[PDB]
Amino acid sequence: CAVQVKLELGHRAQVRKKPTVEGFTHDWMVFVRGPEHSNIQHFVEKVVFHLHESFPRPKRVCKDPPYKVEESGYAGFILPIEVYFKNKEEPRKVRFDYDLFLHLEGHPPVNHLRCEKLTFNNPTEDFRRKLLKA
Ligand SMILES: O=C(COCc1ccccc1)Nc1ccc(Cl)cc1
Ligand SMILES: [Cl-]
């Protein structure tokens, strides 16, 4: 009995009115969530955001919702996101490579969204029950 669930990944980015002391020009926030009123905490163990190496503590871990990271910076980068599942079976996690892009000053703030389909073929009963609760 295969089960399909939905994950939304996205981010916002806005030019700061005043650069930070480091000269960072943008504030941004990247997130993983369920669509509409879906609570993905039923089947998500943790979300790991792998920031660019220039960031302090580049491995950011959210064990509880909201699964998000808020930061400031000066350039966009590819941000690997690992979503770990509440199971003890294959797969333990899934990985997405998120394009954390920023727009130049003058352009409207970034507000970006993509939606990811996860289909689990033959999950264990306990994991199937969690997936179906989201
Ligand atoms: O945007 C930033 C700012 O982050 C670094 C930081 C240093 C000290 C404190 C906070 C944050 N780095 C960055 C570098 C290369 C690429 Cl390709 C994309 C981004
Ligand atoms: Cl991807």
Residue numbers in the entry: 1 to 134
What does the publication say?
Unlike the bromodomains with end-closed binding cavities, the YEATS domain adopts an end-open aromatic “sandwich” cage to recognize histone lysine acylation.
As the crystal structure also revealed that the methoxyl group of hit 2 pointed toward the unoccupied groove surrounded by residues F28, P60, and E75, we substituted the methyl group with a benzyl or phenyl group (compounds 10 and 11). Compound 10 achieved an approximately two-fold enhancement of the affinity for the AF9 YEATS domain. We hence solved the crystal structure of the AF9 YEATS domain in complex with compound 10 with clear electron density, diffracted at 1.8 Å. Therefore, the benzyl substituent of compound 10 had additional interactions with residues P60 and F28 for enhanced affinity to AF9 YEATS. Sequence alignment of the AF9/ENL YEATS domains suggested a conserved aromatic cage in AF9 and ENL. Therefore, compound 10 was a dual inhibitor of AF9/ENL YEATS domains. Compound 10 had weak potency in MCF7 cells using a Cell Counting Kit-8 (CCK-8) assay, but suppressed the proliferation of AF9-sensitive HGC-27 cells more effectively in a dose-dependent manner, which is consistent with the CRISPR result. Inhibitors harboring the new chemotypes were then uncovered guided by complex crystal structures, which revealed a binding mode to form an extra hydrogen bond in comparison with SGC-iMLLT.
